[PDB]
Amino acid sequence: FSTNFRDTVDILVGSLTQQVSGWLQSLEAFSTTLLGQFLEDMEAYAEDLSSVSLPKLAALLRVFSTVVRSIAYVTDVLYRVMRCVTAANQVFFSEAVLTAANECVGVLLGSLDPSMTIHCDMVITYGLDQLENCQTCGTDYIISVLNLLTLIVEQINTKLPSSFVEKLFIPSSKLLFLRYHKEKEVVAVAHAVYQAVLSLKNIPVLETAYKLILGEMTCALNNLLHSLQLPEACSEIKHEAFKNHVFNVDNAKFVVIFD
């Protein structure tokens, strides 16, 4: 059993990955020792990268996530190391490695409970960096990014600064433009993210998000009103971030309904 896991790990690191993953997860110390070698290997890969090592890195991350999901002091160190190694390798620009890293980070963060003071600056920075360059990406990466964001929003409670939520609900945010995707799954996860960010308990951090949403709604109604030669109204819930914008009638109506 102890030596049989090597064959499964090697096979999974080569369409049929679901069968081996399920068998390994349902099959059931040495876990830390097995993960140490994997961590050293991925670190060395990026250290020597500075270009055919991408498949190996993707396979390593996939097997790592699979063994982790098969199931508290080194979780923060491992997460920080993974985020740093992933952000450093910005030349390859691969979506498979990013998806695997996002899934692993999400499951690792969700495994614990909101009763610690883990480093949130690195996680927030990594999320913002990946979101700022997630416009022209595949559908699989978008779903993983949205689910990951949901995991950080739910896990990090009473600790999210007002700056993060403030920057997440402005025109420059990629989520606003991402909500226009024709797919339905993306819209569903986006709505889930909105409800999760709107289901907190602290009023000082939720008031800014509520005001931003109300301001966007007011801007949409103002644009719709001006589209038919009629003066705008609702000046008691306006926002400074939406002083002037150009929104189409269809887009404005869709945004109003979404909010």
Partner: protein
């Protein structure tokens, strides 16, 4: 008590056989009364002309499709993509109103069936469609145009060219535009205005009566839309399908039965101008239609048009 009605037709009767021959069998159901109304429709393969005629003459949406006075398409037949109605049908309601159902125009199924049977069959089908259109435009009061998707850009050309091939101060029957299987987006003020403007620009020289009649706004379909919003409300009607976290429980359009009933009421009260400079009766109208059909069959303009292509 000798004032009993003639008879109540439980089903329609084919007026023109598939071989394009006149059938003299509907005279027994006609009387010697004047001021009669006739209706005709031109459509594509799956627009739903038979269903519209059934629902407007002697049928209700609650009744099963198997008892329709006009044979409608079946699910088991849509797989092969074939036509259901051939030739022209005839049926008179209890209100002394004559209805006429025709076959689809430019139907690929007819061409395919004709292949396995004078230059090319395409011209033959084209002249057949032109003949049916001319006959309808010559002996009908109002003609309803059924459509599936808007912006066809081909039906208008056919209608415009069909008016120049009729046999013979001229008579121009009314043209009613109907949009079958309309979606929720079609029931919007912007879409309605765009459709009206497009129809107006596409039928600038139609020379037919297509405005000032059958106003959808006057039927309370759009309670809030003002009459001044549309530059020229043409005779257009919409019919939706038979009887979502963002907008749960929102249909976006009225009930199918309500619109069907409204269309039936508006069509039943259409004007009945004199077709010719003489009062015609039911039998007289039948004889006139037969003579017109015989004349259009052995015409000259149709032959020239067919030869030119």
């Amino acid at each position: 008590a000798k004032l009993l009605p003639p008879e109540r037709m439980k089903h329609s009767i084919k007026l023109v056989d598939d071989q394009m021959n006149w059938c003299d069998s509907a005279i027994e159901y006609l009387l010697d009364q004047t001021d009669v109304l006739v209706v005709g429709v031109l459509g594509l393969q799956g627009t739903g002309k038979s269903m519209v005629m059934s629902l407007l003459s002697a049928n209700t949406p609650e009744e099963d499709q198997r008892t329709y006075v006009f044979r409608a398409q079946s699910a088991e037949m849509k797989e092969r993509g074939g036509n259901q109605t051939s030739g022209i049908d005839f049926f008179i309601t209890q209100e002394r109103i004559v209805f006429l159902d025709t076959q689809p125009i430019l139907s690929p199924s007819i061409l395919d069936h004709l292949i396995n049977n004078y230059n090319l069959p395409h011209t033959y089908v084209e002249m057949q469609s032109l003949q049916i259109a001319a006959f309808l435009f010559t002996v009908c009061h109002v003609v309803i145009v059924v459509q599936d998707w808007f912006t066809d850009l081909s039906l208008y050309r056919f209608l415009q060219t069909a008016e120049m091939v009729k046999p013979s101060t001229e008579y121009y029957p009314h043209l009613v535009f109907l949009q079958n299987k309309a979606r929720r987006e079609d029931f919007c003020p912007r879409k309605l205005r765009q459709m009206h403007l497009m129809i107006d620009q596409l039928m600038a020289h139609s020379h037919l009566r297509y405005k000032g009649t059958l106003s959808m706004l006057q039927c309370n379909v759009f309670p809030g839309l003002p009459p001044d919003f549309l530059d020229s409300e043409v005779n257009l009607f919409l019919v939706p399908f038979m009887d979502f976290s963002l907008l749960p429980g929102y249909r976006g359009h009225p009930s199918f039965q309500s619109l069907v009933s409204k269309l039936r009421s508006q069509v039943m009260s259409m004007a009945r101008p004199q077709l010719s400079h003489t009062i015609l009766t039911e039998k007289n109208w039948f004889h006139y239609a037969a003579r017109i059909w015989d004349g259009v069959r052995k015409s000259s303009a149709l032959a020239e048009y067919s030869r030119l292509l």
